[PDB]
From Swiss-Prot, chains A, B:
Site features described as Putative hydrophobic membrane-disrupting site (MDiS), chain residue numbers: 3, 10, 16
GO cellular component: extracellular region
Native species: Bothrops jararacussu
Upper lineage: Eukaryota, Metazoa, Chordata, Craniata, Vertebrata
Reported function: Snake venom phospholipase A2 (PLA2) that shows low enzymatic activity even tough it conserves the catalytic residues. Shows a strong myotoxic activity and induces indirect hemolysis, anticoagulant properties, and cytotoxic activities. In vivo, it induces muscle necrosis, accompanied by polymorphonuclear cell infiltration, and edema in the mouse paw. It exerts its function even in the absence of extracellular calcium, indicating it is not a calcium-dependent enzyme. A model of myotoxic mechanism has been proposed: an apo Lys49-PLA2 is activated by the entrance of a hydrophobic molecule (e.g.
GO terms classed as biological process: arachidonate secretion; lipid catabolic process; negative regulation of T cell proliferation; phospholipid metabolic process
Residue ranges, annotated region (Important for membrane-damaging activities in eukaryotes and bacteria): 105-112
Entry similarity comment: Belongs to the phospholipase A2 family. Group II subfamily. D49 sub-subfamily.
UniProt protein name: Basic phospholipase A2 homolog bothropstoxin-II
């Protein structure tokens, strides 16, 4: 579920989703309504695409099972949905993390106004 | 700043903003774009109005000073902006908390689609 996606974000980035990620850029912080502004922003787009593929699932509310005991997220057993959903979440948190290098604090609460229209397809 | 608003939310509600509040209902979880669905949702509207009044301020990025050492948020000293911004944040977190009674988990990631148009004015 989003709660676990959230813990993963934090575990992986050291930043709690709000406000670092939930209000970021044009896609994370604007409901997927703008073209991602950078890597960090694109991770949310990839994240939505990933959930997009799980048509048969409730990615946002199905609680899966994972372990990050040794600092690496390992999705455990569960239904196929859970596992797939968890991979998504893992991937997105890994992605945020993998992009702390270009994370820009100034993209938080970015005016939607400078946000350009979604240009990529899942 | 939003980081402190966030800590306040958590301190007061025991729920981290993401996903409990940032994805809630029609206003918190939809960029202020829908009419609040209930109390919890309305707190975000009140929160935006409160920042709305701080035209001369950067409510989202100005770091204020507050204390919640004895379980009650006390905004400390700072610039008038900081103090006012902090009151806003306090008020919103108190509001979330004061409305855990009707908080509905099913309003998280609520489809914008059922969201009705903003009908109140600050």
């Amino acid at each position: 579920d989003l709660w676990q996606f959230g813990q993963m974000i934090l575990k992986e980035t050291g930043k709690l989703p709000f406000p670092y990620y939930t209000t970021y850029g044009c896609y994370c912080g604007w409901g997927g309504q703008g073209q991602p502004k950078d890597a960090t922003d694109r991770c949310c787009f990839v994240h939505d695409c990933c959930y997009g593929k799980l048509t048969n699932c409730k990615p946002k509310t199905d609680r899966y099972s994972y372990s990050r005991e040794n600092g690496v997220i390992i999705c455990g057993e569960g239904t196929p949905c859970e596992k797939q959903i968890c991979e998504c979440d893992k991937a997105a948190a890994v992605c945020f993390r993998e992009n702390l290098r270009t994370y820009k604090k100034r993209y938080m609460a970015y005016p939607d106004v400078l946000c350009k229209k979604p240009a990529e397809k899942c």
